[PDB]
User: Fold Steroid C26-monooxygenase from Mycobacterium tuberculosis.
Amino acid sequence: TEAPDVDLADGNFYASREARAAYRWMRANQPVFRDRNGLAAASTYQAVIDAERQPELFSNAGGIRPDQPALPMMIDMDDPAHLLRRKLVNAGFTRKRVKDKEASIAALCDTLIDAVCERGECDFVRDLAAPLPMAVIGDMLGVRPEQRDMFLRWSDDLVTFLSSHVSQEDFQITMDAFAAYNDFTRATIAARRADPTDDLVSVLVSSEVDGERLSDDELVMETLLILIGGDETTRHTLSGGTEQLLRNRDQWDLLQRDPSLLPGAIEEMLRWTAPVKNMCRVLTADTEFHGTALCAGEKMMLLFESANFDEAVFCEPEKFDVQRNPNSHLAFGFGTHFCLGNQLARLELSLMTERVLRRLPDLRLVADDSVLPLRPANFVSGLESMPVVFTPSPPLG
Ligand code: HEM
Ligand SMILES: CCOC(=O)c1cc2cc(-c3ccncc3)ccc2[nH]1
Ligand SMILES: [Br-]
Ligand SMILES: [Br-]
Ligand SMILES: [Br-]
Ligand SMILES: [Br-]
Assistant:
């Protein structure tokens, strides 16, 4: 009955395997919780949904990180301006455009598995989970394969900034990474304005809504939002979700014998892993919210992992169950800002997992999860490393 002594802006909290016990106390005793520094956080599924449904009170226009200002990106915007920006960028994310990527994503999955399959061991994080989303989003943005690692480095630097209160040295690194991304992207824009192709910048250049188009400034900001979504999130559901399949081998075995269970497995991997641990909302007025007094101008976190483990919604939430129905998890949020990339992320998860199951059918963890660390970060986090072993096989291509 004593509250957990926690700092919800500290990345070390999210790397602890005790975070879920802290969330459990919040949900049972103070659903809109204030941490040791007074930062407010919605911990229950009900409170998160209710805040998501009230964007005029719980605004994104102060920025979605604690103690960082808004950027001119759709995720830091409110309607009506947000709705126009999202409609413009949606040209890249129509259901048909995303579903048509299936063969190309599958090819990348097979190339990555081909690189390890003869060895009998790999680091699942380094060799499969991190590179696959990077290659997909890189290919959309025109990145040469041998330059993916450079983009991944810029992205890891940007997410480090989003995930902490950086030193001056890490602030400078962040500004350098943006400057390099800006240069590359404005070069792509200029090339595609002169010679359109069918890549993401081409589709976004030509997108038009209510007589409006995206400016070059907006194209840089929106493709940067997409890059980071495309290379810093899905990786952690691939690793951590596969980790749960290997820890609970009855679950691995169900999927291997029935491919039609894969869609529900991907949803359970998303629920469990919740790579995005929080998004902030700024209060536009003083308000009494699920029992807690909130003040105009402060930021409240939405705790999506906590909501995904709320017993009021998910029976036995600490049981990983690929068959779980319903599974209305909040890994992608809810409402006006619901992840634009959700279909792409689900497709990448599906195509890689189906190939892991079939091509590495006896996959096992080298050492159990108790020695596998999570990355300290207050925004997006998952496994650092996941050594796995399997019976070798020959490549496909
Ligand atoms: C498992 C992978 C991913 C997770 C967990 C995730 C999570 C989220 C969350 C939580 C939000 C905010 C929702 C809210 O506050 O209610 C969001 C927004 C967004 N995501 Fe993702 N994301 C993922 C992958 C991606 C990818 C792959 C892309 C693009 C290729 C992407 C693009 C976006 C965009 C553009 C927004 C802003 C939408 C808006 O503000 O209207 N995301 N995502
Ligand atoms: C340091 C400047 O900031 C950015 O470069 C930035 C990128 C970015 C991406 C997300 C995101 C994207 C898609 N899906 C979930 C989250 C959120 C905040 C972000 N900030
Ligand atoms: Br706005
Ligand atoms: Br579809
Ligand atoms: Br594209
Ligand atoms: Br069954």
